[PDB]
From Swiss-Prot, chain C:
Assembly description: Component of the large ribosomal subunit. Mature ribosomes consist of a small (40S) and a large (60S) subunit. The 40S subunit contains about 32 different proteins and 1 molecule of RNA (18S). The 60S subunit contains about 42 different proteins and 3 molecules of RNA (28S, 5.8S and 5S).
Protein name: Large ribosomal subunit protein eL43
GO biological process: translation
Organism: Plasmodium falciparum (isolate 3D7)
GO CC aspect terms: cytosolic ribosome; ribonucleoprotein complex
Gene name in the database record: RPL37A
Alphabetical keyword list: Cytoplasm, Metal-binding, Ribonucleoprotein, Ribosomal protein, Zinc, Zinc-finger
PANTHER family in the record: 60S RIBOSOMAL PROTEIN L37A, LARGE RIBOSOMAL SUBUNIT PROTEIN EL43
Amino acid sequence: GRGAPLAKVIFKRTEKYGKKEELIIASEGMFTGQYISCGTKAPLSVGNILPIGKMPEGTLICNLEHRTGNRGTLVKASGCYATVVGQSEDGKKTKVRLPSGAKKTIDAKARAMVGVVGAGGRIDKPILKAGVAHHKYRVKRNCWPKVRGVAMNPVE
Amino acid sequence: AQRVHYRRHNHYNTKSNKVRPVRTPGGKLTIHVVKKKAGKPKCADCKTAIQGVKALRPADNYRARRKNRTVARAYGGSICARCIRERIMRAFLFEEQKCVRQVLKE
Amino acid sequence: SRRTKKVGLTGKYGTRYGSSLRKQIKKIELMQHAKYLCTFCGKTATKRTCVGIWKCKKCKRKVCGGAWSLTTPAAVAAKSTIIRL
Amino acid sequence: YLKCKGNQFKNKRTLIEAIQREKNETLKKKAIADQLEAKRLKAQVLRNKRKLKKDKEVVA
Amino acid sequence: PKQITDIRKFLKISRKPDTTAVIIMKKKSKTKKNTVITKLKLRTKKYLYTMVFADRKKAERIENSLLPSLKRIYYP
RNA sequence: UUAUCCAUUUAUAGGGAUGAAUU
RNA sequence: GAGAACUUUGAAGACUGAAGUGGAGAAGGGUUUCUUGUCAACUGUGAUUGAACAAGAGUUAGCCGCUCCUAAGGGAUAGCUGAAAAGUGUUUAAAGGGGUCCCCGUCUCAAAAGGGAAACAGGUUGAUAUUCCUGUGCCAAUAGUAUUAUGAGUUAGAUGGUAACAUAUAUAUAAAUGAACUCCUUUACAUAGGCUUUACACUCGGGGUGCGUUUUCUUUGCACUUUACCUUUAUAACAAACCUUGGAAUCAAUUUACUUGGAGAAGAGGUUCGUUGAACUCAAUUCAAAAAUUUGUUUUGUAGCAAUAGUAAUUCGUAAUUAUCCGAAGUGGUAAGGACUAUCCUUGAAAAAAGGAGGGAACGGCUUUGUGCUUUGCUACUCUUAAUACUUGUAUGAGCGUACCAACAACCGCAUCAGGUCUCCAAGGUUAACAGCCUCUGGUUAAAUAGAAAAAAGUAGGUAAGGGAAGUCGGCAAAAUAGAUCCGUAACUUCGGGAAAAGGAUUGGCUCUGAGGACAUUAAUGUUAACUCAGAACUGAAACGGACAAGGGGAAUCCGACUGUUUAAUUAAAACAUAGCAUUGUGAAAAGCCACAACUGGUAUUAACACAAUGUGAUUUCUGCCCAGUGCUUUG
RNA sequence: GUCUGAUGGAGGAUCGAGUUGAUACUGACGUGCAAAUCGUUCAUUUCAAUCACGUUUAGGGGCGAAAGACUAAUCGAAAAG
Ligand SMILES: [Mg+2]
Ligand SMILES: [Mg+2]
Ligand SMILES: [Mg+2]
Ligand SMILES: [Mg+2]
Ligand SMILES: [Mg+2]
Ligand SMILES: [Mg+2]
Ligand SMILES: [Mg+2]
Ligand SMILES: [Mg+2]
Ligand SMILES: [Mg+2]
Ligand SMILES: [Mg+2]
Ligand SMILES: [Mg+2]
Ligand SMILES: [Mg+2]
Ligand SMILES: [Mg+2]
Ligand SMILES: [Mg+2]
Ligand SMILES: [Mg+2]
Ligand SMILES: [Mg+2]
Ligand SMILES: [Mg+2]
Ligand SMILES: [Mg+2]
Ligand SMILES: [Mg+2]
Ligand SMILES: [Mg+2]
Ligand SMILES: [Mg+2]
Ligand SMILES: [Mg+2]
Ligand SMILES: [Mg+2]
Ligand SMILES: [Mg+2]
Ligand SMILES: [Mg+2]
Ligand SMILES: [Mg+2]
Ligand SMILES: [Mg+2]
Ligand SMILES: [Mg+2]
Ligand SMILES: [Mg+2]
Ligand SMILES: [Mg+2]
Ligand SMILES: [Mg+2]
Ligand SMILES: [Mg+2]
Ligand SMILES: [Mg+2]
Ligand SMILES: [Mg+2]
Ligand SMILES: [Mg+2]
Ligand SMILES: [Mg+2]
Ligand SMILES: [Mg+2]
Ligand SMILES: [Mg+2]
Ligand SMILES: [Mg+2]
Ligand SMILES: [Mg+2]
Ligand SMILES: [Zn+2]
Ligand SMILES: [Zn+2]
């Protein structure tokens, strides 16, 4: 149902012997066989997951938490990114610019991924056929086709 | 020409109900149901077929000979030879690199 | 011989949908169906498998890219910025 | 092989004739070239040995 | 059903506890006159064992030299 | 901040400096 | 038989025509099934018939199914709401269960087309059959103690190959140690296009056997000539992947198309899987050619099953013999597998269950003091398959379905109603054709009636001199055209079309000529196919896609861009939808839109390239002026 | 950069049996074979395609490519008491 692709990434259990699985929205540039590093001290590189309070101004981020520990809610659709615009002088606060253009202040300990969401540019191809849109919404929900209001009776 | 009919319970043309005609000594045509093909077992790293083992449905695998399910190396019928060669090289060479990097501190 | 003067690839759409829409389709599908350089193995054998996945026919590495091309300028610029620093 | 894939011969007989023609021509041309180069290489041994023969007299 | 070609192995089976009968089939060959082809079959608990004899004299010698507690069956 | 409300988890370390990893 | 157009038998003339009133199942029916009897009523005419009426019978499973698994989903538990009735279903349950004390962790139902231990042939009844009979196989299970036998291992766990990998053949390839913990594989997956292989099907020419025609002709026309599961079936042969040597531009290999290579190509030699299931002298036999393995054959075998069964014939008395069952090829209808290429803003289930590997816990037999840390002591010990005695509750295979119809009178429509109703098999001729027409196997010749006569009028058809829409609101109805091959095709156009535009010529039969392959001996010689395509001469009451089958065309105007959808039973359209264009709301568990009595929910497995609410309706070219009125919205 | 021949097999491409429907005769029938059938003619067949079984939505409510259509011969508000 989703436009963007998903990465399947394997971490090694630290409190027991074993391996564990995660599914994560992938940023444009990731490849199979790559190592990514997540944490408050990870370096600044595409694909790593860092707290937003350790990123310089201008960095493009995605897959962001609007609260710490949230596990990511904001920048998720294909081709979308945000921008770090300002840092508080006493820490504790970070300012970003959301894809819609709004500006929003977040706790400076929240996490995000470096880079932009993959598969960007998919609203530039004309759909061009009714059947293509029949196949598009066939895997989303029952919202198509649409009859307009002026073509009905007053009861409804 | 002689014409045939299903002999078992299933009377539809599904994947588990495929059909083969055969001539009997009495002189008539009859139908026998055919087993499904089985996928080949695959390498745990590169998802390629494992050489030296048979492809059986698990019921037939359960009652098969011991030697027909394995190969004699360090990872047997689970990882192919190329992958094992690379694994051994990575292990030894990276241990050497760590060893030389450590003593480099002084 | 040359079988077509203008439409080239979009000759499968016949006379439908209007000429400018077919022109935009042609521009997009030239990019979508091309072959790209695999920087890992050196051969030019990378082709799209789904709306955001690209796979090399030789070494079989999978790369996440754009929708109609392997790379997009907005990601190229951000990556170059970070590498410069 | 590439000629046959490109629809130059409609038959087996025509292909046999065409290959015989090409083979005879490429044989004749090479036969000429080798006799020419064999003539050329012969003149050098005089050109090489007269050199040192003159050098043994005028120079040393 | 299984086939045996080695007469020593055929004789070993003939003396085992759960061998219950022998079958003697006599048949004329098809290519020519009389070659009285003979087949000897042993009935064990699990399989029949068939050996094919092209020589009538050898077959005749082998069958009477069998243990006298095996029931005998003649189809032709 | 203790009433009240929300979030995450296996409620798993008090604050700073494309191999293997368990008895 | 009291009584036969519609009961039975024989002979005729015909139909169905494999897309069958032919065979086999599901839903629904429930004894309509079988044998015997029989006619008050019914079987819209008759009736001795019958699915009517009466009396008795008939359905046999370890291997066909259910039963087990999970799906879209249903019902419950804890808690929370509500007077309850009821609504929700982890939302803070000491949840239950499983691996020996610790771990894991709600329960239960939902598929007779999805996943899934295991069987074949012949015979047999009035009525059942992969279920009964005969013969030959397979799967699952099988406790403790001993005793014998089979085989392997150290005198605490075996070998070969440079490698890819290989090895247990005992009645039976049964044994190659391996605890906690951890990772992976099978089950397991879409559509389109062509190429290739095997089996079933159909056909041609030889041999044998029986039958038919025979005024004339016909070395003639027809029928039969068979072979199952199972033995890891052994081997042979093919697409593919991989290994060893080798070291590539004058690039090469190669497919219908493709596609590959210093990340190691061609050439040469090997390993494995899949397909398939006696192929290849395959196996057993020495006539022989070096042994501490080579040849044509001495010769057999349908490889075992297997001829003892089946089929087609000829004889012998009121149950027996005998003979055959074998040589070489074509066509491509159906099914499955293989290696590939292409398409998606579409990427095409899960679980019971089974397998593989990493790691290295534990480890003589004996009987002994001390207590698992001792010993003095001897050398058989550990696994593995099979059989037999004894001890134990009685130590192999549970329960349910199975007759018959499936529409033609057994189902639904008030009925023995021209309606409706889901799957599988599929011969010959003519043909592009599973179309139309005729035929062989199988089925039938019956329909709420029959005989005679034959005018008006009707209904379903056919033909018509001369004219050719003058008829009528209106060319409504009918007629004319049609298959292939060879020529020739305008305006306009979004350059793709229009287009089968419009138009023109040909087509039978018979006798000939020419062109398209393979194989093995030497540019010569022979052996052999299979359907197509060109040309010529003759011929006939000028006919030839001879029946069947099968577009009328042109010049313009209006509407909708196109494929698609709609008022079941008076309206199929210019109506709805659609891609494209524009506007509006919303940065989230204190948000937008919507459900609910309350508790709580949907979008949401979501996050502005997103979700929600409207209008217009492809492309091209455009989209002017008005904020006074009514709405909506912003500041205090 | 442009011309000619072959190969190749795209498309909500074309014709057309079956299947799925219902344009015309304003044909038959209209005490019907039938409370919607019969005959000829017509539309549709690779996709917004067709069919079966299972399952979800219940009355001032549901479902609707929209006709006030359909919800068991009953719908501008079903059936039973
Ligand atoms: Mg309306
Ligand atoms: Mg093996
Ligand atoms: Mg009657
Ligand atoms: Mg007829
Ligand atoms: Mg007929
Ligand atoms: Mg037909
Ligand atoms: Mg009866
Ligand atoms: Mg009777
Ligand atoms: Mg009567
Ligand atoms: Mg009765
Ligand atoms: Mg079964
Ligand atoms: Mg469920
Ligand atoms: Mg169940
Ligand atoms: Mg099933
Ligand atoms: Mg019967
Ligand atoms: Mg056989
Ligand atoms: Mg039965
Ligand atoms: Mg039956
Ligand atoms: Mg009724
Ligand atoms: Mg009827
Ligand atoms: Mg009738
Ligand atoms: Mg009349
Ligand atoms: Mg006439
Ligand atoms: Mg006239
Ligand atoms: Mg007039
Ligand atoms: Mg008039
Ligand atoms: Mg007309
Ligand atoms: Mg025109
Ligand atoms: Mg229209
Ligand atoms: Mg239409
Ligand atoms: Mg109507
Ligand atoms: Mg109508
Ligand atoms: Mg409209
Ligand atoms: Mg729209
Ligand atoms: Mg318009
Ligand atoms: Mg105003
Ligand atoms: Mg079409
Ligand atoms: Mg009609
Ligand atoms: Mg009428
Ligand atoms: Mg109205
Ligand atoms: Zn591998
Ligand atoms: Zn690559």
